[PDB]
Paper text:
Cyt c6 is a small, water-soluble protein (~12 kDa) that contains a heme group as its active center. As an essential electron carrier, Cyt c6 mediates between the cytochrome b6f complex and photosystem I (PSI), enabling electron transfer that is fundamental for sustaining photosynthesis by maintaining the continuous flow of electrons through the photosynthetic chain. The crystal structures of Cyt c6 from both species revealed a conserved fold, consisting of five α-helices, a bound heme group, and loop regions, which closely resembled previously characterized Cyt c6 proteins from other species. The heme was covalently linked to two cysteine residues via thioether bonds, and the central iron atom was axially coordinated by methionine and histidine residues, maintaining consistent coordination geometry in both oxidized and reduced states.
Numbering used by the authors:
A (entry chain A): -1 to 87
B (entry chain D): -1 to 85
Amino acid sequence: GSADLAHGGQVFSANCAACHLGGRNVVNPAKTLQKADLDQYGMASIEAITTQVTNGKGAMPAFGSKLSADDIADVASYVLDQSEKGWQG
Amino acid sequence: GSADLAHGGQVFSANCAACHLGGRNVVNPAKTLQKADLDQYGMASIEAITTQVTNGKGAMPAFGSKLSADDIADVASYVLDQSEKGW
Ligand code: HEC
Ligand code: HEC
């Protein structure tokens, strides 16, 4: 596909899969990356995901000082794309 | 003392149990709060626990901007005390 989504998947594996492998949320099981959960909590957008990745929230760490702006844009795109695809395989 | 440990337990329930319930570690089972693990990684002290809680590490979030210094001292004392008596 696109370069952005591919790089987003690498940012995801290295920074997010520890808690969200395959769209899970092993820490807070009510707040997964499945589309229904993103929709329930108003997180089904690039800007909302970007805000939470940048600032952290609750038990989720912040990445705003550790990732580049492009890294965060790409990982947000990857999450939204995988969520729309049902985190298939 | 007893006051510190009691408040530490409340800070722990509100901020740490999501990942460390009963002294475990839902994200990385190799790095629990059990005495053997704290000893292995040099984390079996108020100073070490305070630092990690304040700064975060890896997938563990930082709490230094969200908790008072007293909150962090107390939760550190709680964790050390639980580890010594076995969670
Ligand atoms: C474990 C330490 C995590 C890391 C690593 C990542 N996330 Fe996370 N995420 C975690 C928690 C505990 C929560 C809920 C926070 C709360 O209190 O509300 C979240 C939530 C999200 C969400 C929203 C999910 C939803 O509302 O259903 C998103 C979109 C999200 N997380 C993305 C994300 C990214 C992109 C990560 C790597 C940069 C990442 N998380 C890491 C726990 C953890
Ligand atoms: C999930 C989002 C966590 C939250 C909430 C808390 N901790 Fe944590 N802890 C977590 C991880 C992923 C790790 C290992 C980090 C690494 O990469 O090395 C830890 C580690 C600790 C340790 C050291 C344990 C050991 O070395 O065996 C301690 C003492 C510790 N965590 C304490 C602690 C406190 C007091 C918390 C609430 C304020 C807390 N953690 C929350 C994951 C998560």
